[PDB]
Amino acid sequence: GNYNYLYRLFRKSNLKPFERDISTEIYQAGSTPCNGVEGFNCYFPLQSYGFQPTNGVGYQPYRVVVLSFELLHAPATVCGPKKSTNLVKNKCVNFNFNG
Amino acid sequence: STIEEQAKTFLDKFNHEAEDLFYQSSLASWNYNTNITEENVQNMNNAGDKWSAFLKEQSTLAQMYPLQEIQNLTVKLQLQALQQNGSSVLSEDKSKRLNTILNTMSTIYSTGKVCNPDNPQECLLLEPGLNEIMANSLDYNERLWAWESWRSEVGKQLRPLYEEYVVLKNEMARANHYEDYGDYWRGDYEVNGVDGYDYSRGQLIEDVEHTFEEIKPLYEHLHAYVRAKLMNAYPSYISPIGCLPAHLLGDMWGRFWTNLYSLTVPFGQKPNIDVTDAMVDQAWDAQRIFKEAEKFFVSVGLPNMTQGFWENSMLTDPGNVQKAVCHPTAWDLGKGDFRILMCTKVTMDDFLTAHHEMGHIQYDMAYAAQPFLLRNGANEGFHEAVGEIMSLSAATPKHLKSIGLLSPDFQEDNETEINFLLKQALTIVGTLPFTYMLEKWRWMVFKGEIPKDQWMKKWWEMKREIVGVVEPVPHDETYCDPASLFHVSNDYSFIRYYTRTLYQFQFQEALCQAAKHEGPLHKCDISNSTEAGQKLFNMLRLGKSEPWTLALENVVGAKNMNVRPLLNYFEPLFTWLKDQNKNSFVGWSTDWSPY
Numbered sequence: 066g067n068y069n070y071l072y073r074l075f076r077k078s079n080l081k082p083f084e085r086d087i088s089t090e091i092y093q094a095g096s097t098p099c100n101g102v103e104g105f106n107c108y109f110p111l112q113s114y115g116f117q118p119t120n121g122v123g124y125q126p127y128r129v130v131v132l133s134f135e136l137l138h139a140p141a142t143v144c145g146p147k148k149s150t151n152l153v154k155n156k157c158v159n160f161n162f163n164g
Numbered sequence: 165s166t167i168e169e170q171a172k173t174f175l176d177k178f179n180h181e182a183e184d185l186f187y188q189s190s191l192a193s194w195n196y197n198t199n200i201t202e203e204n205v206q207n208m209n210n211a212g213d214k215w216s217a218f219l220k221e222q223s224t225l226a227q228m229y230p231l232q233e234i235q236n237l238t239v240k241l242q243l244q245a246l247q248q249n250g251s252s253v254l255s256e257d258k259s260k261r262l263n264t265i266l267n268t269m270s271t272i273y274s275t276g277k278v279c280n281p282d283n284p285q286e287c288l289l290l291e292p293g294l295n296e297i298m299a300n301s302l303d304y305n306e307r308l309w310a311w312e313s314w315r316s317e318v319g320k321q322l323r324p325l326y327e328e329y330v331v332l333k334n335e336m337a338r339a340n341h342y343e344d345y346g347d348y349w350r351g352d353y354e355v356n357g358v359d360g361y362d363y364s365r366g367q368l369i370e371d372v373e374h375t376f377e378e379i380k381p382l383y384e385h386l387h388a389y390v391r392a393k394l395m396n397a398y399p400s401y402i403s404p405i406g407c408l409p410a411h412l413l414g415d416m417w418g419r420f421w422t423n424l425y426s427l428t429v430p431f432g433q434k435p436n437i438d439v440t441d442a443m444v445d446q447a448w449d450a451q452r453i454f455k456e457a458e459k460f461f462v463s464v465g466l467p468n469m470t471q472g473f474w475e476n477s478m479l480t481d482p483g484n485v486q487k488a489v490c491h492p493t494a495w496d497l498g499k500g501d502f503r504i505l506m507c508t509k510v511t512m513d514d515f516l517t518a519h520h521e522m523g524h525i526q527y528d529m530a531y532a533a534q535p536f537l538l539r540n541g542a543n544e545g546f547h548e549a550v551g552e553i554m555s556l557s558a559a560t561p562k563h564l565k566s567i568g569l570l571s572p573d574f575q576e577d578n579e580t581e582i583n584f585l586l587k588q589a590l591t592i593v594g595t596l597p598f599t600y601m602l603e604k605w606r607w608m609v610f611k612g613e614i615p616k617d618q619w620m621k622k623w624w625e626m627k628r629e630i631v632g633v634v635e636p637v638p639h640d641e642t643y644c645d646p647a648s649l650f651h652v653s654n655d656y657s658f659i660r661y662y663t664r665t666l667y668q669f670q671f672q673e674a675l676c677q678a679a680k681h682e683g684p685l686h687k688c689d690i691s692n693s694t695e696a697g698q699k700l701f702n703m704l705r706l707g708k709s710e711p712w713t714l715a716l717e718n719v720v721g722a723k724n725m726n727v728r729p730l731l732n733y734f735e736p737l738f739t740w741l742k743d744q745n746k747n748s749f750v751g752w753s754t755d756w757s758p759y
């Protein structure tokens with residue numbers, strides 16, 4: 066079992082889209098203010114899952130990526146691959162040379 | 165700030181660690197069983213000790229959490245199953261004394277000794293001794309001598325040990341706010357918190373008594389049949405009025421009566437349904453057996469196995485290169501890893517055992533979707549019944565003929581069906597009255613209704629009155645007779661077998677009714693019906709999140725435990741016994757004494 070893959074489990078409020086949390090303070094479960102140590106109302110919200118090679122579907126590690134498509138008042142930087150056909154020397158044809 | 169949030173946080177923090185430790189312990193036990201060395205046993209012991217320490221720490225931490233303010237039934241059940249104090253309710257000295265008593269009883273009982281007189285040798289262990297003696301014995305004198313040596317030599321030395329054991333059990337029960345240890349055993353079947361589906365503890369005893377009274381006629385007919393067969397086979401060895409002896413039942417504990425099948429069969433001249441010769445004479449092995457079992461399970465509607473199940477399982481005896489246990493053990497891990505450890509041969513009994521293990525693995529994969537505190541059946545009998553029903557449905561001749569184990573030209577004779585019904589009766593009902601009597605005696609001795617100097621007296625009077633077994637020679641009160649079993653000396657229940665026997669018949673009847681198949685139950689097919697498989701899987705995925713009564717009602721329809729499937733199955737055999745016992749006496753009398 067691997068224990069290097071940490072993850073956050075408990076939070077006090079929901080997160081916003083496209084937000085990354087940096088602070089890793091302990092979670093407060095009760096009304097007593099946590100003084101930085103664990104207790105009956107203070108537990109560490111960060112844990113780590115276990116990935117084993119003998120685990121079936123649902124426990125295997127899956128690398129998922131998220132592609133965000135946004136556009137605003139700025140020139141385009143990423144487009145699609147434009148194709149190019151074979152030209153003809155002497156023939157009445159329609160041409161499209163870069164726009 | 166409330167208690168529910170803290171409880172959910174504790175559960176989420178504990179479930180992952182519990183699953184990890186359970187996976188580690190299972191891997192250590194697998195490496196120990198598959199590789200007997202000096203370090204694997206130490207690693208397994210260390211893993212078990214770490215798991216026990218972590219579980220005790222988590223239980224002590226969770227004990228501080230209340231149980232009344234939480235309205236969630238699942239969380240309440242998980243906390244009730246986790247906050248169990250166990251043996252910690254007593255003092256440290258009493259706890260260590262109980263542990264030492266358990267250890268010495270386990271070391272003494274698991275070895276055994278014959279030690280025949282006037283012979284300084286041939287004092288083998290329990291397995292190569294009394295087991296092989298009573299296995300295929302056909303003499304009265306040697307069986308009586310073995311029974312006397314087993315009940316006398318190993319009956320008087322364990323009387324103070326058993327007394328201290330039951331005293332410590334009663335003390336632990338009274339210290340945990342329970343009236344008796346039997347109350348703590350029966351509390352596992354009680355379900356509360358659900359309106360219209362709760363089951364009281366006092367109703368279970370009444371239901372068991374009613375089922376036993378309804379089975380009484382079948383057991384009396386079977387006893388009369390066995391007595392008639394013994395009189396016809398052993399003249400002047402059994403009286404037609406008195407009860408049957410204890411050493412002529414073919415078993416030391418009277419659990420399995422299959423040893424007298426070849427002697428009490430009325431149609432022994434007919435061939436059996438064994439398909440071992442049909443498979444050993446062709447290219448067949450355990451791999452093809454497991455493949456056909458998986459095909460049957462997927463035809464019924466059960467999910468498929470993972471990729472790790474067909475690559476880590478050692479389904480072949482490696483031989484003298486390394487020591488490997490061949491005992492069938494349902495290896496459950498709950499984290500996608502599943503495997504079966506059994507040296508399956510090309511016989512039929514091994515085929516049924518492999519089907520049973522595959523059903524166990526299917527149930528494990530079914531309830532694996534729940535946390536570690538819920539990866540188990542509703543009661544302690546469903547986990548075995550789920551595999552037993554599949555093993556029984558796979559033993560049908562039509563299924564073996566469709567697969568290829570049975571020849572298509574094999575005729576269907578009623579004599580084979582009668583013999584199969586008689587064998588099933590002798591192997592199932594032959595121990596149900598003994599199980600009920602033992603359970604009632606243990607309940608009464610844990611509650612305190614039996615005098616101290618009348619334990620064996622009441623035991624023998626119930627074995628003579630309720631059961632139809634009588635001892636050939638009476639013993640004194642110094643010989644502890646009920647302590648001759650394994651479950652009574654290792655803190656294991658006995659009513660679980662009866663509950664499993666009822667639940668397997670209930671499930672078989674439900675699957676036969678859902679399949680829209682007509683005819684008797686012994687030939688009713690379960691495969692080729694995805695609706696019944698889906699209905700069964702809908703109940704297998706429940707686990708402990710729902711009461712067992714609602715789980716049974718969702719598949720069978722009955723509110724409580726039912727016994728009518730057993731009667732519907734044994735009706736042909738019951739009528740056959742009534743027709744054969746027309747000119748013979750039925751029942752037994754306690755006035756006769758074979759002394």
Ligand SMILES: *[C@@H]1O[C@H](CO)[C@@H](O)[C@H](O)[C@H]1NC(C)=O
Pocket residue numbers: 462466467468
């Ligand atoms: C099992 O395999 C069969 C064969 O492809 C498939 O149809 C079925 O959906 C599978 N079931 C599960 C639970 O994986």
